[PDB]
Design a protein around this nucleic acid. Structure first.
Ligand SMILES: Nc1nc2c(ncn2[C@H]2C[C@H](O)[C@@H](COP(=O)(O)OP(=O)(O)OP(=O)(O)O)O2)c(=O)[nH]1
Ligand SMILES: [Ca+2]
Ligand SMILES: [Ca+2]
Ligand SMILES: [Ca+2]
Ligand SMILES: [Ca+2]
Ligand SMILES: [Ca+2]
Length: 901
DNA sequence: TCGCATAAGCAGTCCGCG
DNA sequence: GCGGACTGCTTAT
């Protein structure tokens, strides 16, 4: 096989590399890599190296990496550009793997681990590590085994061995329900003392050294705890055995309000799953506890135990160990679904970076571009210092707040990356500038043509047309990957809808799910068999179809995120190719494209309807337009349609055969006007929205910018078995909104859009009457909590104290003195409840750590003093009043003359 | 919240507004 | 009460 790196490090003058050799074996080597950097040289000097602007360079070969680094310093002292890849391990990988990397994941050791630490005096601080590690479960992807290290003897209690038999039994048998599919994969090792547990763990680690190391909060908790505990018991040298090169570094992670420490293990790639999830999931969660995320992702119930975690080992060691094992398995289950490890490996190997660098789009793009340019013997410019400066972004149209009955939406495929490609925006393709007219003059095609030679953006920038820039070239490659995966995602989605339809009529038989590839649209053959399947088989097929869709979503959306990140990176001062001329060329072109095409669509529709000055485009944001289709429907007449699907077909056909060719023509003209390199503005129909045929539903509404709801029947070619709500920006979509309130508001919106005013009034009346019975967690607000100290004045709110921070200070006073009560962690999330006047907490609200039950010390007082009235008005009534006034209807029935009877 | 970008919404504080 | 100046937080794209 072709060789591939696993990890790469610079240690002084050596590159340390773990890799897979041509025989599939893991190896390690130390290489005295001689880096090359570059200086500009005279024209008379013959060379094959040129910088990105075509200026000649001489290559400087250094005796070692430190010499190269020192040379960079002296060049700065002199005041001359030191060109080339200054991150020598990236240059090493580029030299050593000069081909597209084909990797084999089965050879990559992926370790998933979790530790337990009993602590009587609150949270066990990893930097102190003063409490024994009493359990480690370490899953190894190569062995496919869970290695369980169990401490039987501790200062906090002596316990009996964990029992695998009890672990396997149902909760109803007094067991722990460790999933049967992992029971045979557990390798259990009890220890009589912590020293032997840890020594054996290190020996084990030496035999099975992780390449990718993951788990939940491992970078912030488990790794520094294990490192520091081993350090405290045995000394530094022993702790450094966690690194295959015996090198570690305390790295200080700084943010706006404070800093924290992690342990860098040289020769290991740490991909903490919490951070993978935050980057790649595109969710914003009320809590990031593993219990909360596991429930959300997998629909598994919370791991249930009595008493505090600090007493679980002594009271129920059996459950203590089983829950440690299950916790590791939960992360593997989330990854089986979401496939974030797979994504990380894909992206890292494509870019030729350390896998952990996938968290940084700047680093990722720096490596992609470097490798691309190196292939042509071109030399990358030195990174430079720039002051942070604001720059303009997208245009967003101010909508008239209203109901909107029939709506068709359109938006650009991969807008910003497509703009980059169309205009040819790149550091080395800048050709000059032209004299800019007000933006509206381009929007209206009255401004003079910018250039008859170069490709232009309305911010004043001109670009070469003779050759593609490196940025367009490399962005196109990832875009193409993205498009492939989105295709699979949409196919799985359409396939899911076929299964849902079939589930209306399940057959009474015993059969099996069909063995199919859900990434491809079901054939007629498959559709026929589906219509004969049982509900059991159909539900399993649906599950598989949805898993396939999830896998496609992960692959496509994060590739979309990467290419959009390149557009953003051009506006980040740490990017090697930072240039506000290019960043603004993208955004300003975007502003023009939207407003240009708004004008074109209005003109086209005013002509087909024979009207004048009529606005068909009601809204748009960045790269999208929302078109009122009421007049299109009314030109046919509602009574001509057999059912909802009939008018949806008509609008879909209208969008595809009339709207889109008109849109394409408008954009082709715009391309010629800007003299762009290639027409790539592809604005396809997104949504077709409206009320169910013959209902009193309103179809959709806008309250304002970035705030709307649509009843959608077809989304990017997916025809739903059941209508789906597209709700953007409203409180139903905000993690800060109480869970039960999100649900109630969504149902209010559903009723507005599908059924009408009277239905909405029925539901509001009922919700208002019953809501006090809702569980307190379900009706609590959520907020991130920053700067708790800033607003804390002797345990009380300082000036301008935010509401949620006030709540935390209330909590802090209420639990004062307790070393055991859960502490609110700076920067994490809290649940927030208002408190009625005259409560014993002495303030108007209380907050506690999100994803948790409030401590029993105060729970009862909180429940007793909860202000349901304030809660209802703020989270439910206020937003609903907003939705309904915008939509011009009433959530409460107004009096009429019929009341006289 | 270490990790690409800007636009823009709403909650809440403080305080004016005769 | 509401709204503006401001902070804080959270979305849409
Ligand atoms: N820098 C940056 N720009 C973004 C981000 N999200 C959206 N944008 C910008 C760039 C996008 O091309 C543009 C339109 O966003 P969309 O959500 O419509 O995505 P896009 O058109 O890229 O892909 P699509 O083909 O519509 O799925 O808005 C982001 O997270 N970072
Ligand atoms: Ca635990
Ligand atoms: Ca788009
Ligand atoms: Ca599309
Ligand atoms: Ca059937
Ligand atoms: Ca869009």
């Amino acid at each position: 096989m072709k060789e591939f790196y696993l990890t790469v490090e610079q240690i002084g003058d050596s590159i340390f590399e773990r890799y897979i050799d041509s025989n599939g074996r893991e190896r390690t080597r130390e290489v005295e890599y001689k880096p090359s950097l570059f200086a500009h040289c005279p024209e008379s000097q013959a060379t094959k190296y040129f910088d990105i602007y075509g200026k000649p360079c001489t290559r400087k070969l250094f005796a070692n990496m430190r010499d190269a680094s020192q040379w960079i310093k002296r060049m700065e002292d002199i005041g001359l550009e030191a060109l080339g890849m200054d991150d020598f391990k990236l240059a090493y990988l580029s030299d050593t793997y000069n081909y597209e990397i084909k990797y084999d994941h089965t050879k990559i050791r992926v370790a998933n681990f979790d530790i337990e630490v009993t602590s009587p005096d609150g949270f066990p601080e990893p930097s102190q590590a003063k409490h024994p590690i009493d359990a480690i479960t370490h899953y190894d992807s190569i062995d496919d085994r869970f290695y369980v290290f169990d401490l039987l003897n501790s200062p906090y209690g002596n316990v009996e061995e964990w029992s695998i038999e009890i672990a396997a039994k149902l909760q109803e048998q007094g067991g722990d329900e460790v999933p049967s599919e992992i029971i045979d994969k557990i390798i259990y090792m009890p220890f009589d003392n912590e020293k032997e547990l840890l020594m054996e763990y290190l020996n084990f680690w030496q035999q099975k050294t992780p390449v990718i190391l993951t788990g939940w909060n491992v970078e912030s908790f488990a790794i520094p705890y294990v490192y520091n505990r081993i350090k405290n018991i045995f000394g530094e040298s022993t702790a450094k055995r966690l690194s295959p090169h015996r090198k570690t570094r305390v790295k200080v992670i700084e943010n706006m309000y404070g800093s924290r420490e992690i342990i860098t293990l040289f020769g290991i790639s740490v991909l903490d799953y919490i951070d993978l999830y935050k980057k790649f999931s595109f969710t914003n969660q009320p809590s990031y506890s593993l219990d909360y995320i596991s429930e959300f992702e997998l629909n598994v119930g919370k791991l249930k135990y009595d008493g505090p975690i600090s007493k679980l080992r002594e009271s129920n060691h059996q459950r203590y160990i089983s829950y440690n094992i299950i916790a590791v398995y939960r992360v593997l289950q989330i990854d089986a679904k979401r496939q974030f490890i797979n994504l990380s490996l894909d992206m890292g190997y494509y870019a030729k970076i350390q896998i952990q660098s996938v968290f940084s789009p700047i680093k990722t793009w720096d490596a992609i571009i470097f490798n691309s340019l190196k292939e042509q013997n071109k030399v990358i410019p030195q990174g430079r210092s720039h002051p942070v400066q604001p720059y303009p972004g997208a245009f967003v149209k101010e909508p008239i707040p209203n109901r909107y009955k029939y709506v068709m939406s359109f938006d650009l495929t991969s807008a910003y990356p497509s703009i980059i490609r169309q205009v040819n925006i790149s550091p080395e393709t800048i050709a000059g500038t032209f004299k800019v007219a007000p933006l509206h003059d381009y929007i209206n095609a009255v401004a003079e043509r910018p250039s008859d030679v170069y490709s232009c953006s309305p911010n004043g920038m001109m670009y070469y047309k003779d050759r593609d820039g490196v940025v367009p070239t490399e962005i196109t490659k990832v875009f193409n990957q993205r498009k492939e995966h989105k295709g699979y995602m949409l196919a799985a989605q359409r396939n899911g809808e076929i299964i849902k339809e079939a589930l209306h009529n399940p057959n009474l038989s015993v059969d099996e799910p069909l063995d199919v590839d859900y990434r491809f649209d079901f054939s007629d053959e498959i559709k026929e068999k589906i219509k004969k399947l049982s509900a059991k088989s159909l539900n399993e097929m649906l599950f598989r179809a949805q898993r396939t869709e999830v896998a496609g979503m992960t692959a496509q959306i994060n590739r979309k995120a990467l290419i959009n990140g390149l557009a953003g990176a051009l506006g980040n001062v740490w990017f090697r190719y930072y240039d506000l001329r290019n960043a603004t060329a993208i955004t300003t072109f975007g502003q023009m494209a939207l407003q240009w095409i708004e004008r074109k669509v209005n003109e086209y529709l005013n002509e087909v309807c024979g009207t004048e000055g009529e606005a068909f485009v009601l809204y748009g944001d960045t790269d999208s337009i929302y078109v009122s289709a009421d007049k299109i429907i009314d030109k046919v007449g509602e009574s001509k349609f057999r059912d909802t699907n009939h008018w949806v077909d008509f609008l879909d056909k209208f969008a595809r055969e009339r709207m889109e060719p008109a849109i394409d023509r408008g954009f082709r003209e715009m391309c010629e006007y800007m003299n762009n390199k290639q027409h790539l503005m592809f604005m396809d129909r997104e949504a077709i929205a409206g009320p169910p045929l013959g209902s009193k539903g309103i179809g959709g509404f806008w309250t304002g910018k970035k705030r709307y709801a649509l009843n959608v029947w077809d989304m990017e070619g997916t025809r739903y078995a059941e209508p789906k709500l597209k709700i953007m920006g409203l409180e139903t979509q905000k993690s800060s909104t109480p869970k039960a309130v999100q649900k109630a508001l969504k149902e209010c919106i559903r009723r507005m859009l599908q059924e009408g005013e009277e239905s909405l009034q029925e539901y509001f009346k009922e919700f208002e009457k019953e809501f006090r019975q809702l569980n307190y967690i379900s009706i609590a607000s959520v907020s991130s909590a920053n700067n708790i100290a800033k607003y804390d004045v002797g345990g009380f709110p300082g000036p301008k104290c935010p509401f949620h921070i006030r709540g935390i200070l209330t909590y802090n006073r209420a639990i004062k003195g307790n070393i055991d009560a859960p502490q609110v962690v700076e920067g994490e999330k809290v649940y927030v409840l208002p408190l009625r006047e005259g409560n014993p907490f002495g303030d108007k609200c209380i907050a506690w750590p999100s994803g948790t039950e409030i401590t029993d010390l105060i729970k009862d007082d909180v429940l007793h003093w909860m202000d349901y009235t304030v809660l209802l008005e703020k989270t439910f009534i206020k937003p609903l009043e907003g939705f309904t006034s915008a939509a011009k209807l009433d959530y409460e029935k107004k009096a009429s003359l019929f009341d006289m009877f």
